[PDB]
Structures are given as structure tokens and as C-alpha cells.
Design a protein around this ligand. Structure first.
Ligand SMILES: CC(C)(COP(=O)(O)OP(=O)(O)OC[C@H]1O[C@@H](n2cnc3c(N)ncnc32)[C@H](O)[C@@H]1OP(=O)(O)O)[C@@H](O)C(=O)NCCC(=O)NCCS
Ligand SMILES: CC(C)(COP(=O)(O)OP(=O)(O)OC[C@H]1O[C@@H](n2cnc3c(N)ncnc32)[C@H](O)[C@@H]1OP(=O)(O)O)[C@@H](O)C(=O)NCCC(=O)NCCS
Ligand SMILES: [Cl-]
Ligand SMILES: [Cl-]
Ligand SMILES: [Cl-]
Ligand SMILES: [Cl-]
Lengths: 504, 504
């Protein structure tokens, strides 16, 4: 069944190699792609090959690459190998690209995900020369049907001088209808429009990205696969964390601080997230609702079981198994899922209005409950802040969850001072590890420290943490947030020097 | 003429001392008061004396004090002198209260100002025993007309078990009508109402605070002045900063990145703020609009001249001469100013929608442009984060302005690593000192550092900053945000140990 239903736009079909030639050295390129879903695949590959060849000849050939969020080996991977990206934003998870970033070979800034569209329109990244977007189909009307994510695609389409569409036959035609694209002013020139969303399941727009066809310079027929999440079940540590949170949710409900169906939930990806979602699947809270960035295995299962009514997101992040399931039952799931532009899914105005519960991971937290989401030892990028700040600050409740240790016990997730800060004390109310849960609402910093140390820290590290805090209370410059500046970052340096935070 | 226009409530008038007897040890007390304006005065003084008396007899007497933001000598001052406050939130500028906080004698948490009402309703502060609110008048139907600020007063009235009103005849009767109080769900239980503000000059509510008269336990007739702080006359450092900033606005206009009337402006108070307001007054930009936390002297000047068309705020913050000016012309200024609940003035949804330009001060920034607004050496509280987070993250443009040094040259305002972080890199785009202006838009951390070091740091400290940076780039665990953890906080320790950050 022909995917390009606009007859005239079929004349714009050309090979991936020829399309890649439209991209010039120095260009700013905006692409689809979010949580490894719906990023362009073939043009980037071709571009990378031509970039390597050019380099060998002595011709500079790099681009600035702005995405929705993370992509995959075909985009981030290949361009990184070719050393073809001089600047990248706002979120990467490709190892090759991560290495370029951490070597200082590619410049990187991890903007709040919900702000990217607005900053792009304001001109922060420069003029967009190209928008390269993956499509499931093109409608008779010239509408562009997105694939497994929406991300920033509508904005990039608006901004770009020229547009390249990759129509990918690998993607399920039945995705058509699942997306909700608003034509209102969310991220454009002030004064912006009021975004009329008052319920997580409320659609406000249409199923297609809009673009002036005069701007489409090439359409490339492709056939390649998105990246998948791993099929891996939560361990005992994740389950313990999930148990503490579920008990908390229960107590809140019983105290009437949460409705029996809780509030719209924002969850992440990974073992902890999956344990929480697995817990909620069999939990006592009915008619749950999701207002998140991503649809993962967990949320799929609850939508399946009926324990969750609807789920809003910008993207998918599914195991091969889960992907097989949804593709077989797309007509069922399409009625349960809304995929939104990321500047809507991640809108602080909407998140606060709906009263979302934010549940996020972290690298580390200090004893006062400042959170590092990004930079190991304060300098080595992991993934990026992503939407954790959009949600943490705007949510009804901001919860951070993590194993109390990393690297086989050689690193403590609770430290005297975070080597880098992404979420300040004000943006984190609840902490959970396999050791217990710390409820920090209404507490001063010294009060926070007492809860975090006593409830959350691993027994191997707790006495060391208490010792730091007790000595700081005694000798710190001020006593409002006591620190010993000579040792605040010493555990981190000790890891660097010896490979462990534990004394020898 | 009579300020209490509802006859029934006149029966609840009583002496300040007697009213203060309603407040018991351990009570949570919510009061009016924001930037030195509109806080209760006589009841707190009476309370303080009774506390001191109890203490002398070995009897405990302390309260939890929750406010709009800063108060004055009659409130924060007296109670702190009496050691009568066990917990304080969210924002203080009184020097005695500051000492209690930094000595560990008063527990303190500086919540984001826009969030305080919401967290209070969620119960983070506990159950409110008392609301203590200053009024201009009481209307025929028992509405409470606020005075020189709105702050959190409507929310404290809703929550408190008992209410005490201070009717202050020092306050101008023609303040009635200047306030806009909404009965919509801004900070209550989700789902919240949409706050329909699409223009800075838009009113959405009415002129009075509402309260069940059955809750009013006392009314005190008073006559006492707000804290009208002396006008901070711009110095050459401030004039230079304003000069760089205004030059910057000028360039943005000519490149069509701002309209000729700029965008809604949020500014603070003091030296630099005053210099900026004077520059706008003399500047080329017409039809300016203020959407801020406070109205200051310089704003009044533009409203008078017609350079500014409207000013939205939660509070006044005026010198004696400005206070007298508006008092003789309250009818004129009443038409040009809207005072709002602080959960509306500081609403991220609205700030972003309007596209405000945020201009804020700081203690320090590190070379990567993370900002500390609160904690000296990381441990000693100054004032509090206030609304800087509300505005910085939500704004169209986030600007931080400061002298490049402090303590007469002995401290650098630009450092290797900030001792405490209030505003992450993502929340700060422009830095201005008397040395120059750093435009960070679209830059990676390393690129930010190169701009901050060259444009903003003081010549006394630039070489030291550059040497830290150079060696970090060579040795740091990762090269994305290079640091040397052995010396990142060493300048702060040097200051603690020697009284200067410069070496010997
Ligand atoms: C913080 C974050 C990296 C943790 O991921 P996670 O999978 O949930 O946690 P994990 O325990 O599995 O650890 C992930 C990696 O970080 C490393 N890590 C975690 N904590 C660490 C620490 N304190 N020190 C050093 N490394 C650490 C782990 O070693 C692991 O790396 P590895 O693959 O080499 O073993 C992740 O949540 C993230 O990138 N956050 C930012 C984006 C975001 O929050 N978006 C919001 C919704 S998705
Ligand atoms: C950060 C802040 C304290 C700066 O104040 P400012 O008026 O701009 O400039 P100042 O230099 O006069 O700061 C005042 C004090 O901070 C001290 N200070 C400033 N920078 C310092 C530094 N790097 N190290 C140590 N002390 C410093 C000054 O010495 C001064 O001390 P003092 O009160 O004993 O005289 C102030 O902006 C603030 O409290 N910010 C938080 C709230 C806010 O931004 N809300 C939004 C609208 S106001
Ligand atoms: Cl909105
Ligand atoms: Cl709180
Ligand atoms: Cl709103
Ligand atoms: Cl940016």
C-alpha cells in the first residue's frame, strides 16, 4: 500500500546519497528522534560516509545536530564515527557520540527537553538549514505522518530552509492516528497561546505534521529498524525500591494527600522504572493515568491489564517483545495512547496544572538532597538532563529513585556533596533506595541530611556520611547548610585515585 | 472615615497584646508581607515581648513563621531578637533572623516563591493555626483589602484555623482597587484551573481577600510604617552593567530578536536594578511593560513618564521619597499597577506565556555559568532563592548581573566551581558584570567558560580562572565539563582561611 499518498510529492523521491548532498558543511540540522525511536536512518549513514571521504581529502565537513532526544547507531553512531558533528543538542545515549562528547571532540549542551523547540525558534542554535524527519506516510493532503515519536519535528519543519523526509516502510502504517499535533503557539513568539489541555487524555490537534511542500527538497524511501530497549527484568534492588514507593503511595492515599487513583504519572526507563510499573500493575490503585515522556514496557502492560486508562507521551521505548505485542494489537493500543510534541508533553504549565507525580533516576544525591542526573565525577557526561527538570520542578511530587551504591559497591549514591547539580533541594521532595525512603517535605537542609543519611544511605557508607555531617556541623563556615570544603569532593577524588570511595 | 465598613466585625476589635495571646507555642502562623511591605506589625511586637518573658522564666515559646517573602523589623526582627521562631519559610532579609538561621537556632527552607501557596495547601508546613494579615480596610460585605503587597495572604486565610487582622491606617485608603485576587484554583488540589492571563495588564479576579468572618478571632487597629529601604543610588559598577545590558537589548532589537518595546520585564531591587531602570527610562525603547515580583522607584518613574504602560507585581518596594510620591498620586498610579497573588505573579505557566525577560542578581557563578544566589561559601545563608528560580527557568531570556568581585576585591564573583548551586547552566543564558557581557546561547559548557572568563571575570582573577581551566582540560576525569576536584573549592577555603581569594 503506497505510503506517499500525495501523488505530486512522489516526484521528489531520490536516493539517500543524493539527498545527503543537500547537507553542507556548517549546516544546522534538525531531526526526528526520541528515546531511540523515529530518527532518520539512511541519509545520516550516507552523510557519514561522504564526511569521512571529505576529511581524508582535507575538506572540512561537520554539522550541528539538534534532535528531539536520543537517536541510535545509524544517526548518532555513524556521524560520531565519521567525526562529523561539531555541536549536539539536547540529549544523546549513543556510546560513540558520548565518547566524542567526553573527549571534547563534539560540543554538547543538554537543554531542558521541553524548552528545545522555543530556543530553536528564538535562534539559539542558529538558522536551521535542514529538517530531516522520518515519516510513516504522507497523506493525500501533504501531511507528514510521524513514526514512533513526535519530539521536536513540527518545530524543525517550521524553521528549516529545506526539508528531507525519510518514509520508512519498516514502521507500522497503523501508527497513523496516534499522534496529536497542535497548530497553536506553544514555542513561538510571545505572547504564546494558552494550551487548553486539562486532562491527560485530551487531544487538541491533528494526526499530521504540517509543512509547505515547496520546502520539501527530497523524499527518501527507507527500510530500517528503530533501536529497542533491552528485555531485562528488575532485580532485587529495584524491587525493594518499588516496594518502598508503593507503601508510600498507600500511606499518602490513606492520609488523603493523594486520590485513590493517584495523579498523572511520569516515569522513566530502566530497571527501577520497570519495577515501579510492575508494582503498579498489581497494585491497589485503579484507573491510573500516564502523562510522561515515553511509553515503555511497564505502561504497555498496564494499558493492557486495564489498571491504567490512558498514557500520554512523546515517544516509545519498547523491548522487542513489547514491540511485537503492540504491533500485533495496534488498534487496541492506539485508543489508549496519545503521542504529543515534546514541548507539550514537557510543558511546565501543563505538568503543574495536571498535578503530575514525577519519578526519576539519578547518578547521585548529596546529604542535603541536591541531585546529579548527568555528570560522573562532575565532568563526564552520561546521557543528559533530558526532561527530569521540566518534571521535577513542575510536579505535585518530585521523587528520585536509585540503588544506594554503584559500581559493585565501590561508589556511594549518597555523597557529602554532589560533584555536579541538576536538581536543587527545592526540586526534590522524596528519595528512595533499596535501604528505605526519605520524606523531606517541610524540612530544613540539616533536617534533610538526617533523613537522607539514616533512611537512604548504604550501611557501608552511612557512618562515613554521618561523620562528615557531624564534623561539618561543628566546623562549617555557616551552619545553615554545613560543609567541610576541604573534604566535600574528596570521596569523588578518592574514586578517581583508587577506584573506590571506601578507604583502604 | 471608617476603615471597618462591615458593622458586625467591629465587635472583634481588640488590643495588640490581647490578640497576640491567641498565638500559642508551637503554632504555625502564616502572615502577609513581601519585600518589606504589608506585613503585620503590632501583634508581632506584642508577641515578641511575651515570648521573651516566657523564656526568662524557663518556659518555651516559639512558632513556625510562614510568609509571602521578606518582612521587616517589627516582625522578623522582633521575633528573632526574642528567639521566638523555630522554623521560617520561604524568604527573609532581616539581619537578626539571618543570624538565627545561620547559627542553627531557626530552621529554614527557602521554597520557590511561586510554589509556597501550593506546598502549604499540600500540608508541607503542617496545619496552619493562625493567619495574621495587614489590611487597608474591611468592606461592607467583609472583604479584606490588602495593603502594600498581596503575597500568600489569600492562601493563609483559607488554611488557618483562626484569623487576626491588623487594620493599618498608615496605609493609603486608595490602595483599594489596586489588587487582583483570584478565586480560581491556582495552588489547590489538581487538576488546577487554567489561569487565563494573556496580557500583563489583565485582571482575572477582584479587589478583596475573602475569609469566613466566623474565623476572624481579632481585629487590631494599627498605625505604623512599612520597611521603606533607602534608595540605593547607582554607582559606576552598576552604571557599567546597565550600559552593557542596554547595549545588548539594543542589538537584539536591531536583529529582530526582540520587539522595539522589548518583552515583559522582571527585575529585582538595589544598586544594579536601579541603574537598569534608569537606563530604560533614558533609553530608545517605548511602551515597556513590567511583569515582576515588585514595583520599585524606577518603575514608578516610567509609569509617570509613559515609558512603561503597566506594571504587574505582588508587592511594592519603594524608598521614602517614592512612597510619598505614589501616596499623593495614588489615583494615577492605581490605574497603572496591578498587585497579584504571588502564586500568580510567579506562575511559570504565565511567565513563559508572556515571554518575560528575567534580570537577577547572584552571589557567584562558576566558569560554566552555574549560579549561586543564596549560600556564601556554600553554607551561610544570605536571603533565599526567592522568585529567581521561578523567573530564571520560565523566562524567554534569563540574565544574571553582578559586580565581578565582592568584599572590596577580596572575592571573585566568578569561580572554578560554585560552592552551592541555585540555577543550573540550563537556566542562565546571559551574564553581565562591569567587565562585559557573556552571551551563552547555544554554547557547550567549555564554550560557556571561554565566554564567561574573557567577558565577565575581573582582571585580578582571570589568569587564575584560566589556569584552573587549562589544567582541568588536560586532567579532568571527563572533558565535557572539566574540573580538578582537588582544587575546585579551594578558593572558597582560601577565603575562609585568609580573608581573600587571591594568593600570597
Ligand atoms: C541517572 C541515569 C543515568 C541512571 O540510569 P539508570 O539506568 O536508571 O540507573 P543505573 O543504575 O542502571 O545506572 C546507569 C549507568 O550510570 C552509572 N552510574 C549510576 N550511578 C553512578 C554513580 N553514582 N557513579 C558513577 N556511575 C554511576 C551506572 O554505572 C550505569 O553505567 P554502566 O552502564 O556503565 O554500568 C538516568 O536516569 C538518566 O540518564 N537521567 C537523565 C534523564 C532523565 O532523567 N529523563 C527523565 C525521564 S526518562
Ligand atoms: C544574590 C543577591 C544576594 C545579590 O544582592 P545584590 O543587591 O544584587 O548585590 P550585593 O552585592 O549588594 O549583595 C549583598 C550582599 O551579598 C554579598 N555578596 C555578594 N556577592 C558575594 C560573594 N561572591 N561572596 C560573598 N558575599 C557576597 C555582599 O557582600 C553583600 O553582603 P552584605 O549584605 O553583608 O553587605 C540578591 O540578588 C538575592 O538575594 N537574590 C535571591 C532572590 C532573587 O533573586 N529574587 C528575584 C527578584 S529580587
Ligand atoms: Cl498553557
Ligand atoms: Cl516543602
Ligand atoms: Cl495556566
Ligand atoms: Cl541554549
Amino acid at each position: 500500500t503506497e505510503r506517499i499518498r500525495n501523488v505530486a510529492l512522489r516526484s521528489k523521491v531520490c536516493p539517500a546519497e543524493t539527498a545527503s548532498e543537500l547537507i553542507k558543511h556548517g549546516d544546522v540540522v534538525g531531526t526526528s528522534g526520541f528515546t531511540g525511536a523515529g530518527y532518520p536512518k539512511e541519509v545520516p549513514k550516507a552523510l557519514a560516509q561522504r564526511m569521512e571521504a571529505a576529511h581524508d581529502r582535507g575538506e572540512k565537513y561537520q554539522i550541528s545536530l539538534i534532535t528531539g532526544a536520543s537517536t541510535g547507531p545509524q544517526l548518532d553512531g555513524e556521524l560520531a564515527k565519521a567525526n562529523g558533528v561539531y555541536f549536539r543538542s539536547p540529549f544523546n545515549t549513543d556510546a560513540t557520540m558520548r565518547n566524542r562528547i567526553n573527549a571534547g571532540e563534539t560540543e554538547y549542551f543538554d537543554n531542558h527537553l521541553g524548552q528545545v523547540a522555543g530556543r530553536a525558534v528564538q535562534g539559539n542554535y542558529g538558522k536551521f538549514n535542514i529538517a530531516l524527519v522520518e515519516a510513516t506516510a504522507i497523506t493525500e493532503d501533504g501531511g507528514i505522518v510521524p513514526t514512533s515519536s513526535v519530539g521536536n519535528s513540527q518545530t524543525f519543519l517550521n524553521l528549516a530552509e529545506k526539508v528531507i523526509i525519510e518514509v520508512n516502510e519498516w514502521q507500522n502504517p497503523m501508527l497513523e492516528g496516534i499522534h496529536d499535533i497542535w497548530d497553536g503557539n506553544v514555542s513561538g513568539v510571545p505572547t504564546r497561546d494558552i494550551v487548553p489541555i486539562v486532562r491527560a487524555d485530551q487531544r487538541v490537534g491533528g494526526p499530521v505534521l504540517r509543512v509547505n511542500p515547496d520546502k520539501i527538497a527530497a523524499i527518501v524511501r527507507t527500510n530500517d529498524r528503530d533501536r529497542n530497549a533491552p528485555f531485562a527484568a528488575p532485580d532485587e534492588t529495584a524491587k525493594a525500591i518499588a516496594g518502598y514507593l508503593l507503601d508510600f503511595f498507600g500511606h499518602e492515599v490513606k492520609q488523603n494527600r493523594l486520590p485513590p487513583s493517584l495523579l498523572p504519572l511520569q516515569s522513566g526507563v530502566g530497571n527501577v522504572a520497570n519495577a515501579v510499573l510492575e508494582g503498579l500493575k498489581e497494585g491497589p490503585f485503579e484507573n491510573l493515568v500516564g502523562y510522561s515522556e515515553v511509553i515503555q514496557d511497564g505502561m504497555l502492560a498496564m494499558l493492557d491489564s486495564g489498571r491504567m486508562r490512558i498514557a500520554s507521551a512523546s515517544s516509545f521505548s519498547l523491548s522487542p517483545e513489547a514491540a511485537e505485542e503492540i504491533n500485533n494489537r495496534m488498534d487496541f493500543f492506539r485508543s489508549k495512547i496519545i503521542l504529543r510534541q515534546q514541548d507539550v508533553s514537557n510543558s511546565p504549565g501543563i505538568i503543574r496544572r495536571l498535578g503530575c507525580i514525577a519519578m526519576n533516576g539519578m547518578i547521585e544525591a548529596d546529604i542535603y538532597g541536591n541531585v546529579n542526573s548527568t555528570r560522573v565525577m562532575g565532568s563526564k557526561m552520561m546521557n543528559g538532563i533530558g526532561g527530569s527538570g521540566d518534571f521535577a520542578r513542575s510536579s505535585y511530587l518530585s521523587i528520585f529513585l536509585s540503588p544506594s551504591t554503584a559500581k559493585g559497591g565501590k561508589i556511594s549514591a549518597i555523597v557529602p556533596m554532589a560533584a555536579h547539580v541538576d536538581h536543587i533541594m527545592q526540586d526534590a521532595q522524596i528519595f528512595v533506595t533499596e535501604q528505605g525512603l526519605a520524606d523531606l517535605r517541610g524540612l530544613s537542609p540539616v533536617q534533610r541530611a538526617r533523613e537522607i543519611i539514616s533512611k537512604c544511605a548504604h550501611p557501608d557508607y552511612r557512618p562515613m556520611l554521618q561523620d562528615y555531617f557531624d564534623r561539618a556541623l561543628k566546623n562549617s563556615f555557616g551552619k545553615h547548610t554545613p560543609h567541610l570544603l576541604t573534604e566535600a569532593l574528596s570521596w569523588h577524588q578518592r574514586f578517581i585515585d583508587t577506584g573506590t570511595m571506601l578507604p583502604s
